Design an enzyme around this catalytic site. Sequence first.
Site, mmCIF file in Angstrom:
data_model
loop_
_atom_site.group_PDB
_atom_site.id
_atom_site.type_symbol
_atom_site.label_atom_id
_atom_site.label_comp_id
_atom_site.label_asym_id
_atom_site.label_seq_id
_atom_site.Cartn_x
_atom_site.Cartn_y
_atom_site.Cartn_z
ATOM 1 N N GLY A 191 7.273 46.434 -105.703
ATOM 2 C CA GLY A 191 7.786 45.264 -106.373
ATOM 3 C C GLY A 191 6.653 44.321 -106.695
ATOM 4 N N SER A 192 6.906 43.039 -106.479
ATOM 5 C CA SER A 192 6.007 41.995 -106.939
ATOM 6 C C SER A 192 4.684 41.917 -106.158
ATOM 7 C CB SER A 192 6.763 40.670 -106.927
ATOM 8 O OG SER A 192 7.932 40.807 -107.755
ATOM 9 N N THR A 193 4.555 42.701 -105.097
ATOM 10 C CA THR A 193 3.279 42.803 -104.397
ATOM 11 C C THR A 193 2.178 43.485 -105.220
ATOM 12 O OG1 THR A 193 3.939 44.855 -103.232
ATOM 13 C CG2 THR A 193 4.333 42.755 -102.091
#
EC number: 3.4.16.4
Length: 498
Positions: A240-242
Amino acid sequence: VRHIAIPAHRGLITDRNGEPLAVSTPVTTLWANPKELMTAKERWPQLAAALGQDTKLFADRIEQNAEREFIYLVRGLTPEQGEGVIALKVPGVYSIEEFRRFYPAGEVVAHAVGFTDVDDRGREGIELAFDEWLAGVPGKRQVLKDRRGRVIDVQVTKNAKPGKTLALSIDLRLQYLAHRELRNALLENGAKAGSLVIMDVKTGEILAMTNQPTYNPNNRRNLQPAAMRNRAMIDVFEPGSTVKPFSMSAALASGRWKPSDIVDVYPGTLQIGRYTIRDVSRNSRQLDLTGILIKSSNVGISKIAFDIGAESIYSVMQQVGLGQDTGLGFPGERVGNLPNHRKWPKAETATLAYGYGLSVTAIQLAHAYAALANDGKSVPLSMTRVDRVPDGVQVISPEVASTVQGMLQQVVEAQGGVFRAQVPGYHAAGKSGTARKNAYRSLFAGFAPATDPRIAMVVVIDEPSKAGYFGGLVSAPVFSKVMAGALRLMNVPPDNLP
Ligand SMILES: *C(=O)[C@@H](NC(=O)[C@@H](C(=O)O)c1ccccc1)[C@@H]1N[C@@H](C(=O)O)C(C)(C)S1
Ligand SMILES: [Cl-]
Protein backbone atom coordinates in the site's frame (compact mmCIF):
# COMPACT_ATOMS: atom_id res chain seq x y z
CA VAL A 1 29.62 -58.26 15.47
CA ARG A 2 27.36 -55.25 14.80
CA HIS A 3 27.42 -51.45 15.12
CA ILE A 4 25.38 -49.06 17.28
CA ALA A 5 25.17 -45.30 16.66
CA ILE A 6 27.01 -42.82 18.90
CA PRO A 7 24.87 -39.64 19.01
CA ALA A 8 26.64 -36.36 18.17
CA HIS A 9 26.13 -33.22 20.26
CA ARG A 10 24.25 -30.68 18.12
CA GLY A 11 25.73 -27.18 17.94
CA LEU A 12 24.51 -24.39 20.18
CA ILE A 13 22.52 -21.51 18.69
CA THR A 14 23.05 -18.11 20.31
CA ASP A 15 21.91 -14.59 19.59
CA ARG A 16 24.41 -11.98 18.41
CA ASN A 17 25.76 -11.34 21.94
CA GLY A 18 26.07 -15.02 22.93
CA GLU A 19 22.74 -15.61 24.72
CA PRO A 20 21.68 -19.28 24.27
CA LEU A 21 18.68 -19.78 21.92
CA ALA A 22 18.84 -23.54 21.25
CA VAL A 23 20.70 -26.06 23.43
CA SER A 24 21.00 -29.84 23.19
CA THR A 25 20.55 -31.31 26.67
CA PRO A 26 21.47 -34.90 27.74
CA VAL A 27 18.45 -37.22 27.54
CA THR A 28 18.07 -40.98 28.14
CA THR A 29 16.04 -43.30 25.90
CA LEU A 30 15.12 -46.86 26.84
CA TRP A 31 14.78 -49.82 24.52
CA ALA A 32 14.20 -53.53 25.06
CA ASN A 33 15.11 -56.83 23.46
CA PRO A 34 11.76 -58.70 23.63
CA LYS A 35 13.54 -62.06 23.39
CA GLU A 36 15.26 -61.18 26.69
CA LEU A 37 11.97 -59.81 28.12
CA MET A 38 10.27 -63.12 27.24
CA THR A 39 12.48 -64.83 29.88
CA ALA A 40 11.39 -62.44 32.71
CA LYS A 41 7.61 -62.03 32.32
CA GLU A 42 7.07 -61.69 36.10
CA ARG A 43 8.97 -58.34 35.90
CA TRP A 44 6.69 -56.85 33.20
CA PRO A 45 3.96 -55.34 35.41
CA GLN A 46 6.45 -53.31 37.50
CA LEU A 47 8.17 -52.12 34.29
CA ALA A 48 4.76 -51.28 32.76
CA ALA A 49 3.91 -49.22 35.87
CA ALA A 50 7.26 -47.41 35.64
CA LEU A 51 6.27 -46.35 32.09
CA GLY A 52 2.73 -45.19 32.96
CA GLN A 53 1.37 -47.98 30.76
CA ASP A 54 -1.41 -50.51 31.31
CA THR A 55 0.03 -53.89 32.31
CA LYS A 56 -2.13 -55.89 29.92
CA LEU A 57 -1.58 -53.55 26.94
CA PHE A 58 2.15 -53.55 27.68
CA ALA A 59 2.22 -57.35 27.89
CA ASP A 60 0.33 -57.55 24.60
CA ARG A 61 2.99 -55.39 22.89
CA ILE A 62 5.95 -57.57 23.97
CA GLU A 63 4.11 -60.78 23.04
CA GLN A 64 3.36 -59.47 19.53
CA ASN A 65 6.97 -58.29 19.11
CA ALA A 66 8.34 -61.52 20.63
CA GLU A 67 10.39 -62.58 17.58
CA ARG A 68 12.08 -59.15 17.25
CA GLU A 69 15.45 -58.26 18.79
CA PHE A 70 14.85 -54.50 19.23
CA ILE A 71 11.98 -52.15 20.09
CA TYR A 72 11.76 -48.73 21.77
CA LEU A 73 10.22 -48.47 25.25
CA VAL A 74 10.28 -44.69 25.49
CA ARG A 75 12.35 -41.84 24.03
CA GLY A 76 13.73 -38.71 25.67
CA LEU A 77 13.44 -39.19 29.43
CA THR A 78 15.60 -37.20 31.85
CA PRO A 79 18.84 -38.93 32.98
CA GLU A 80 17.53 -39.34 36.56
CA GLN A 81 14.14 -40.71 35.40
CA GLY A 82 15.79 -43.18 33.00
CA GLU A 83 17.93 -44.36 35.92
CA GLY A 84 14.67 -45.17 37.77
CA VAL A 85 13.67 -47.77 35.18
CA ILE A 86 17.29 -48.98 34.85
CA ALA A 87 17.46 -49.39 38.65
CA LEU A 88 14.70 -52.05 38.71
CA LYS A 89 17.08 -54.38 36.85
CA VAL A 90 14.68 -55.91 34.30
CA PRO A 91 16.46 -58.32 31.91
CA GLY A 92 16.58 -57.11 28.30
CA VAL A 93 16.06 -53.43 29.12
CA TYR A 94 18.83 -51.12 27.84
CA SER A 95 19.64 -47.39 27.74
CA ILE A 96 20.80 -44.92 25.08
CA GLU A 97 22.16 -41.47 25.96
CA GLU A 98 20.80 -39.12 23.28
CA PHE A 99 20.45 -35.31 23.23
CA ARG A 100 17.29 -33.19 23.17
CA ARG A 101 16.89 -29.57 22.16
CA PHE A 102 15.69 -26.96 24.64
CA TYR A 103 14.72 -23.38 23.65
CA PRO A 104 15.30 -21.01 26.64
CA ALA A 105 13.47 -18.03 25.05
CA GLY A 106 10.60 -20.34 23.97
CA GLU A 107 7.97 -18.64 21.81
CA VAL A 108 9.83 -15.30 21.70
CA VAL A 109 12.15 -16.59 18.95
CA ALA A 110 10.38 -19.78 17.80
CA HIS A 111 9.69 -18.55 14.25
CA ALA A 112 13.32 -17.60 13.62
CA VAL A 113 14.91 -20.62 15.32
CA GLY A 114 12.47 -23.38 14.37
CA PHE A 115 12.73 -26.83 15.97
CA THR A 116 14.18 -30.35 15.73
CA ASP A 117 13.00 -33.99 15.28
CA VAL A 118 12.74 -36.73 17.89
CA ASP A 119 16.15 -37.55 16.31
CA ASP A 120 17.36 -33.95 16.84
CA ARG A 121 17.28 -33.21 13.11
CA GLY A 122 16.24 -29.65 12.21
CA ARG A 123 12.87 -29.58 10.43
CA GLU A 124 12.03 -25.84 10.51
CA GLY A 125 13.59 -22.36 10.35
CA ILE A 126 17.25 -21.90 11.22
CA GLU A 127 17.48 -25.43 12.70
CA LEU A 128 16.58 -26.74 9.22
CA ALA A 129 18.46 -24.15 7.13
CA PHE A 130 21.77 -24.67 9.01
CA ASP A 131 21.19 -28.36 9.81
CA GLU A 132 24.41 -29.78 8.29
CA TRP A 133 26.48 -27.19 10.17
CA LEU A 134 24.71 -27.71 13.51
CA ALA A 135 24.22 -31.50 13.33
CA GLY A 136 27.79 -32.83 13.42
CA VAL A 137 28.42 -36.52 12.64
CA PRO A 138 27.30 -39.55 14.71
CA GLY A 139 29.84 -42.24 15.63
CA LYS A 140 29.86 -46.04 15.40
CA ARG A 141 30.28 -48.45 18.29
CA GLN A 142 31.53 -51.99 17.65
CA VAL A 143 29.28 -54.33 19.66
CA LEU A 144 29.12 -58.12 20.18
CA LYS A 145 25.69 -59.73 20.58
CA ASP A 146 24.74 -63.35 21.29
CA ARG A 147 22.06 -65.04 19.14
CA ARG A 148 19.22 -63.57 21.30
CA GLY A 149 20.62 -60.97 20.76
CA ARG A 150 21.76 -59.75 24.15
CA VAL A 151 24.65 -57.31 23.70
CA ILE A 152 27.57 -58.80 25.67
CA ASP A 153 30.69 -53.69 23.84
CA VAL A 154 34.02 -53.90 21.97
CA GLN A 155 35.38 -50.44 20.98
CA VAL A 156 34.61 -47.15 19.20
CA THR A 157 34.94 -47.83 15.46
CA LYS A 158 34.36 -44.19 14.46
CA ASN A 159 34.18 -41.23 16.86
CA ALA A 160 31.34 -38.72 17.10
CA LYS A 161 32.13 -35.15 16.05
CA PRO A 162 29.91 -32.47 17.63
CA GLY A 163 28.03 -29.86 15.60
CA LYS A 164 29.35 -26.33 15.12
CA THR A 165 28.12 -23.30 17.08
CA LEU A 166 25.98 -20.62 15.38
CA ALA A 167 25.44 -16.99 16.41
CA LEU A 168 22.38 -15.36 14.87
CA SER A 169 22.08 -11.70 13.86
CA ILE A 170 19.13 -11.41 16.29
CA ASP A 171 19.68 -9.30 19.45
CA LEU A 172 17.63 -11.08 22.12
CA ARG A 173 17.05 -7.82 24.00
CA LEU A 174 15.61 -6.17 20.86
CA GLN A 175 13.65 -9.37 20.09
CA TYR A 176 11.97 -9.38 23.53
CA LEU A 177 11.02 -5.70 23.25
CA ALA A 178 9.56 -6.17 19.75
CA HIS A 179 7.70 -9.31 20.79
CA ARG A 180 6.14 -7.74 23.87
CA GLU A 181 5.12 -4.57 22.02
CA LEU A 182 3.70 -6.38 18.96
CA ARG A 183 1.74 -8.66 21.33
CA ASN A 184 0.34 -5.69 23.28
CA ALA A 185 -0.59 -3.95 20.01
CA LEU A 186 -2.44 -7.08 18.82
CA LEU A 187 -4.55 -7.51 21.98
CA GLU A 188 -5.38 -3.79 22.31
CA ASN A 189 -6.67 -3.71 18.70
CA GLY A 190 -8.37 -7.13 18.46
CA ALA A 191 -6.01 -8.00 15.61
CA LYS A 192 -5.74 -11.49 14.10
CA ALA A 193 -2.03 -11.46 13.17
CA GLY A 194 1.10 -9.33 12.88
CA SER A 195 4.79 -8.98 12.05
CA LEU A 196 7.61 -6.72 13.12
CA VAL A 197 11.09 -6.70 11.65
CA ILE A 198 14.07 -4.61 12.81
CA MET A 199 17.16 -4.26 10.63
CA ASP A 200 20.66 -2.79 10.97
CA VAL A 201 20.93 -0.31 8.12
CA LYS A 202 24.74 -0.45 7.98
CA THR A 203 25.43 -4.22 8.26
CA GLY A 204 22.38 -6.00 6.73
CA GLU A 205 21.58 -7.84 9.99
CA ILE A 206 18.06 -8.81 11.01
CA LEU A 207 18.14 -7.63 14.63
CA ALA A 208 14.58 -8.76 15.43
CA MET A 209 11.90 -10.83 13.69
CA THR A 210 8.66 -11.47 15.59
CA ASN A 211 5.14 -12.55 14.68
CA GLN A 212 1.77 -13.10 16.27
CA PRO A 213 0.38 -15.69 16.85
CA THR A 214 3.39 -17.72 17.98
CA TYR A 215 3.97 -21.06 19.75
CA ASN A 216 6.26 -22.58 22.42
CA PRO A 217 8.56 -25.13 20.70
CA ASN A 218 9.47 -26.64 24.10
CA ASN A 219 5.99 -28.22 24.30
CA ARG A 220 5.13 -30.87 21.67
CA ARG A 221 1.43 -30.52 22.60
CA ASN A 222 1.21 -26.89 21.34
CA LEU A 223 2.62 -27.30 17.82
CA GLN A 224 -0.51 -25.95 16.07
CA PRO A 225 0.41 -25.18 12.38
CA ALA A 226 -1.32 -21.77 12.12
CA ALA A 227 0.80 -20.39 15.00
CA MET A 228 4.05 -21.84 13.55
CA ARG A 229 4.39 -19.59 10.47
CA ASN A 230 7.21 -17.06 10.32
CA ARG A 231 4.86 -14.58 8.69
CA ALA A 232 7.59 -11.94 8.24
CA MET A 233 9.20 -14.21 5.64
CA ILE A 234 6.54 -16.67 4.41
CA ASP A 235 3.48 -14.40 4.04
CA VAL A 236 2.93 -11.74 1.39
CA PHE A 237 0.79 -8.62 1.26
CA GLU A 238 0.24 -5.47 -0.80
CA PRO A 239 2.43 -2.77 0.85
CA GLY A 240 0.00 0.00 0.00
CA SER A 241 1.06 3.53 0.75
CA THR A 242 4.37 2.43 2.29
CA VAL A 243 5.79 2.23 -1.28
CA LYS A 244 5.08 5.91 -2.05
CA PRO A 245 8.63 6.94 -1.03
CA PHE A 246 9.98 4.68 -3.78
CA SER A 247 7.51 6.21 -6.26
CA MET A 248 8.84 9.57 -5.09
CA SER A 249 12.44 8.36 -5.59
CA ALA A 250 11.58 7.58 -9.21
CA ALA A 251 10.00 11.06 -9.60
CA LEU A 252 13.06 12.90 -8.23
CA ALA A 253 15.47 10.69 -10.23
CA SER A 254 13.47 11.43 -13.40
CA GLY A 255 14.78 15.00 -13.53
CA ARG A 256 11.18 16.25 -13.91
CA TRP A 257 10.39 16.91 -10.21
CA LYS A 258 11.80 18.58 -7.09
CA PRO A 259 10.37 18.54 -3.54
CA SER A 260 8.99 22.09 -3.87
CA ASP A 261 7.01 21.30 -7.07
CA ILE A 262 3.23 21.51 -6.74
CA VAL A 263 0.50 19.06 -7.72
CA ASP A 264 -3.23 19.92 -7.79
CA VAL A 265 -5.30 17.20 -6.10
CA TYR A 266 -8.76 18.85 -6.05
CA PRO A 267 -11.40 17.47 -5.47
CA GLY A 268 -9.56 14.52 -3.84
CA THR A 269 -10.67 11.99 -6.44
CA LEU A 270 -9.51 11.22 -9.97
CA GLN A 271 -11.70 9.26 -12.38
CA ILE A 272 -9.78 6.86 -14.66
CA GLY A 273 -12.58 5.29 -16.71
CA ARG A 274 -14.45 2.82 -14.48
CA TYR A 275 -11.80 3.19 -11.73
CA THR A 276 -11.87 6.15 -9.34
CA ILE A 277 -8.70 7.07 -7.45
CA ARG A 278 -9.65 8.45 -4.02
CA ASP A 279 -7.89 10.24 -1.18
CA VAL A 280 -9.03 9.91 2.45
CA SER A 281 -8.66 13.65 3.04
CA ARG A 282 -10.40 15.72 0.34
CA ASN A 283 -10.03 19.37 1.39
CA SER A 284 -6.82 20.06 -0.57
CA ARG A 285 -5.93 21.67 -3.89
CA GLN A 286 -2.22 22.51 -4.24
CA LEU A 287 0.20 20.22 -2.39
CA ASP A 288 3.97 20.09 -2.73
CA LEU A 289 5.68 16.71 -2.94
CA THR A 290 6.48 16.56 0.78
CA GLY A 291 2.82 17.40 1.39
CA ILE A 292 1.68 14.52 -0.84
CA LEU A 293 3.58 12.12 1.46
CA ILE A 294 2.50 13.89 4.70
CA LYS A 295 -1.20 13.70 3.77
CA SER A 296 -0.69 10.44 1.82
CA SER A 297 -2.58 11.69 -1.24
CA ASN A 298 -3.26 8.86 -3.70
CA VAL A 299 -4.39 11.37 -6.30
CA GLY A 300 -1.14 13.31 -5.96
CA ILE A 301 1.10 10.27 -6.35
CA SER A 302 -0.95 9.03 -9.32
CA LYS A 303 -0.55 12.30 -11.25
CA ILE A 304 3.24 12.16 -10.69
CA ALA A 305 3.28 8.53 -11.87
CA PHE A 306 1.43 9.53 -15.06
CA ASP A 307 4.06 12.20 -15.67
CA ILE A 308 7.15 10.00 -15.11
CA GLY A 309 5.73 6.63 -16.22
CA ALA A 310 5.29 3.24 -14.50
CA GLU A 311 8.56 1.80 -15.89
CA SER A 312 10.66 4.20 -13.81
CA ILE A 313 8.65 3.30 -10.68
CA TYR A 314 8.91 -0.46 -11.34
CA SER A 315 12.71 -0.32 -11.64
CA VAL A 316 13.18 1.53 -8.33
CA MET A 317 10.99 -1.10 -6.65
CA GLN A 318 12.83 -3.96 -8.35
CA GLN A 319 16.22 -2.43 -7.48
CA VAL A 320 15.34 -2.06 -3.79
CA GLY A 321 14.21 -5.71 -3.65
CA LEU A 322 10.40 -5.60 -3.53
CA GLY A 323 9.07 -8.84 -5.01
CA GLN A 324 12.60 -10.21 -5.57
CA ASP A 325 14.56 -13.12 -4.12
CA THR A 326 16.30 -12.03 -0.90
CA GLY A 327 18.80 -14.90 -1.27
CA LEU A 328 18.66 -15.69 2.47
CA GLY A 329 17.51 -19.29 2.02
CA PHE A 330 15.08 -19.30 4.95
CA PRO A 331 12.80 -22.35 4.60
CA GLY A 332 9.50 -21.50 2.89
CA GLU A 333 10.42 -17.85 2.29
CA ARG A 334 8.34 -16.21 -0.43
CA VAL A 335 9.59 -13.99 -3.26
CA GLY A 336 6.28 -12.19 -3.90
CA ASN A 337 6.00 -10.33 -7.20
CA LEU A 338 6.04 -7.05 -9.08
CA PRO A 339 3.46 -7.13 -11.89
CA ASN A 340 4.61 -6.72 -15.47
CA HIS A 341 3.04 -5.23 -18.58
CA ARG A 342 4.04 -4.58 -22.18
CA LYS A 343 2.13 -1.29 -22.08
CA TRP A 344 1.08 0.13 -18.70
CA PRO A 345 -2.47 1.55 -18.70
CA LYS A 346 -3.28 4.50 -16.41
CA ALA A 347 -5.17 2.52 -13.76
CA GLU A 348 -2.33 -0.02 -13.38
CA THR A 349 0.23 2.81 -13.26
CA ALA A 350 -1.60 4.58 -10.41
CA THR A 351 -2.26 1.49 -8.29
CA LEU A 352 1.45 0.50 -8.54
CA ALA A 353 2.49 4.01 -7.44
CA TYR A 354 0.46 3.67 -4.20
CA GLY A 355 1.22 0.02 -3.47
CA TYR A 356 -1.42 -2.27 -4.98
CA GLY A 357 -0.93 -4.97 -7.61
CA LEU A 358 2.38 -6.06 -6.06
CA SER A 359 3.00 -8.49 -3.19
CA VAL A 360 5.94 -8.20 -0.76
CA THR A 361 7.21 -9.75 2.48
CA ALA A 362 7.78 -7.81 5.72
CA ILE A 363 11.50 -8.56 5.39
CA GLN A 364 11.60 -7.12 1.86
CA LEU A 365 9.82 -3.95 2.97
CA ALA A 366 12.31 -3.52 5.83
CA HIS A 367 15.24 -4.20 3.46
CA ALA A 368 13.97 -1.52 1.07
CA TYR A 369 13.66 1.10 3.86
CA ALA A 370 17.12 0.12 5.13
CA ALA A 371 18.68 0.86 1.71
CA LEU A 372 16.87 4.22 1.62
CA ALA A 373 18.16 5.08 5.13
CA ASN A 374 21.68 3.90 4.17
CA ASP A 375 21.86 6.70 1.55
CA GLY A 376 20.48 4.46 -1.25
CA LYS A 377 22.99 1.64 -0.71
CA SER A 378 21.55 -1.87 -0.20
CA VAL A 379 23.65 -4.13 2.06
CA PRO A 380 22.95 -7.87 1.63
CA LEU A 381 20.59 -9.33 4.26
CA SER A 382 21.94 -11.63 6.99
CA MET A 383 20.38 -13.92 9.63
CA THR A 384 23.77 -14.74 11.14
CA ARG A 385 26.06 -12.36 13.03
CA VAL A 386 28.06 -10.23 10.58
CA ASP A 387 31.67 -9.49 11.58
CA ARG A 388 33.04 -8.46 8.17
CA VAL A 389 30.35 -6.54 6.25
CA PRO A 390 29.96 -7.48 2.56
CA ASP A 391 29.98 -4.79 -0.14
CA GLY A 392 26.56 -3.17 -0.67
CA VAL A 393 24.95 -2.20 -3.97
CA GLN A 394 23.94 1.38 -4.85
CA VAL A 395 20.25 1.14 -5.65
CA ILE A 396 19.03 4.72 -5.31
CA SER A 397 21.27 7.75 -5.90
CA PRO A 398 22.76 9.11 -2.63
CA GLU A 399 21.37 12.56 -3.39
CA VAL A 400 17.82 11.34 -4.09
CA ALA A 401 17.84 9.00 -1.08
CA SER A 402 18.89 11.90 1.15
CA THR A 403 16.06 14.10 -0.13
CA VAL A 404 13.49 11.33 0.34
CA GLN A 405 14.85 10.71 3.87
CA GLY A 406 14.26 14.39 4.70
CA MET A 407 10.75 14.28 3.28
CA LEU A 408 10.08 11.21 5.44
CA GLN A 409 11.33 12.96 8.58
CA GLN A 410 8.75 15.63 7.78
CA VAL A 411 5.90 13.08 7.55
CA VAL A 412 6.76 12.04 11.12
CA GLU A 413 7.53 15.57 12.46
CA ALA A 414 5.42 18.14 10.53
CA GLN A 415 1.86 19.14 11.41
CA GLY A 416 -0.81 16.89 9.90
CA GLY A 417 1.73 14.05 10.01
CA VAL A 418 2.16 10.72 11.79
CA PHE A 419 3.03 12.30 15.17
CA ARG A 420 2.46 8.96 16.94
CA ALA A 421 5.61 7.64 15.18
CA GLN A 422 7.75 10.26 16.93
CA VAL A 423 10.56 8.81 19.03
CA PRO A 424 11.30 10.73 22.24
CA GLY A 425 14.86 12.05 22.20
CA TYR A 426 15.42 11.23 18.51
CA HIS A 427 14.59 12.35 14.98
CA ALA A 428 12.67 9.63 13.13
CA ALA A 429 11.41 9.16 9.57
CA GLY A 430 8.84 6.88 7.98
CA LYS A 431 5.57 6.32 6.16
CA SER A 432 2.18 4.95 7.21
CA GLY A 433 -0.13 2.69 5.22
CA THR A 434 -3.55 1.04 5.27
CA ALA A 435 -4.21 -1.65 2.65
CA ARG A 436 -7.46 -3.50 1.91
CA LYS A 437 -7.68 -7.30 1.70
CA ASN A 438 -14.03 -4.52 5.05
CA ALA A 439 -10.70 -6.00 6.19
CA TYR A 440 -7.46 -4.01 6.54
CA ARG A 441 -3.74 -4.23 7.23
CA SER A 442 -2.35 -1.44 9.41
CA LEU A 443 1.26 -0.52 8.50
CA PHE A 444 4.17 1.65 9.50
CA ALA A 445 7.67 1.59 7.96
CA GLY A 446 10.60 3.80 8.88
CA PHE A 447 14.07 4.36 10.31
CA ALA A 448 16.08 6.35 12.88
CA PRO A 449 17.92 8.43 13.97
CA ALA A 450 17.32 10.76 10.99
CA THR A 451 20.68 12.54 11.30
CA ASP A 452 22.66 9.27 10.93
CA PRO A 453 20.36 6.24 10.52
CA ARG A 454 21.06 3.01 12.36
CA ILE A 455 17.83 1.01 12.41
CA ALA A 456 15.00 0.36 9.93
CA MET A 457 11.70 -1.13 11.13
CA VAL A 458 8.40 -2.40 9.68
CA VAL A 459 5.25 -3.03 11.75
CA VAL A 460 2.40 -4.95 10.04
CA ILE A 461 -0.89 -5.57 11.90
CA ASP A 462 -3.67 -7.70 10.36
CA GLU A 463 -7.35 -6.81 10.73
CA PRO A 464 -7.53 -4.49 13.73
CA SER A 465 -11.10 -4.50 15.09
CA LYS A 466 -11.33 -1.45 17.42
CA ALA A 467 -12.58 1.86 15.93
CA GLY A 468 -9.29 3.35 14.67
CA TYR A 469 -7.43 1.14 12.17
CA PHE A 470 -5.16 3.44 10.11
CA GLY A 471 -1.44 2.61 10.07
CA GLY A 472 -0.79 5.94 11.80
CA LEU A 473 -3.07 5.03 14.72
CA VAL A 474 -2.43 1.31 15.09
CA SER A 475 1.11 0.61 13.83
CA ALA A 476 2.90 3.97 14.35
CA PRO A 477 2.80 3.86 18.18
CA VAL A 478 4.47 0.43 18.06
CA PHE A 479 7.29 1.86 15.88
CA SER A 480 7.64 4.66 18.46
CA LYS A 481 8.02 2.42 21.53
CA VAL A 482 10.12 -0.31 19.90
CA MET A 483 12.42 2.20 18.17
CA ALA A 484 12.78 4.18 21.44
CA GLY A 485 13.88 1.04 23.30
CA ALA A 486 16.04 -0.41 20.52
CA LEU A 487 17.99 2.84 20.07
CA ARG A 488 18.89 3.18 23.76
CA LEU A 489 19.56 -0.58 24.08
CA MET A 490 22.10 -0.13 21.26
CA ASN A 491 23.54 3.00 22.97
CA VAL A 492 22.77 5.28 20.01
CA PRO A 493 23.33 8.98 20.84
CA PRO A 494 20.09 11.02 21.02
CA ASP A 495 19.91 13.56 18.19
CA ASN A 496 16.80 15.50 19.26
CA LEU A 497 17.38 16.59 22.86
CA PRO A 498 16.24 20.15 23.70
C1 LIG B 1 -2.35 3.92 1.37
O1 LIG B 1 -2.47 2.92 2.05
C2 LIG B 1 -3.65 4.71 1.12
N1 LIG B 1 -4.87 3.92 1.41
C3 LIG B 1 -5.96 4.22 0.68
O2 LIG B 1 -5.91 5.12 -0.14
C4 LIG B 1 -7.33 3.56 0.79
C5 LIG B 1 -7.49 2.31 -0.02
O3 LIG B 1 -6.51 1.59 -0.28
O4 LIG B 1 -8.64 2.04 -0.41
C6 LIG B 1 -7.82 3.35 2.18
C7 LIG B 1 -7.62 2.17 2.88
C8 LIG B 1 -8.14 2.03 4.17
C9 LIG B 1 -8.88 3.07 4.75
C10 LIG B 1 -9.10 4.24 4.04
C11 LIG B 1 -8.58 4.38 2.76
C12 LIG B 1 -3.55 6.01 1.95
N2 LIG B 1 -2.67 5.88 3.09
C13 LIG B 1 -3.29 5.51 4.33
C14 LIG B 1 -2.35 5.66 5.49
O5 LIG B 1 -1.43 6.50 5.40
O6 LIG B 1 -2.51 4.91 6.48
C15 LIG B 1 -4.55 6.37 4.39
C16 LIG B 1 -5.66 5.66 5.16
C17 LIG B 1 -4.29 7.74 5.00
S1 LIG B 1 -5.05 6.57 2.70
CL1 LIG C 1 6.44 -16.20 -3.80
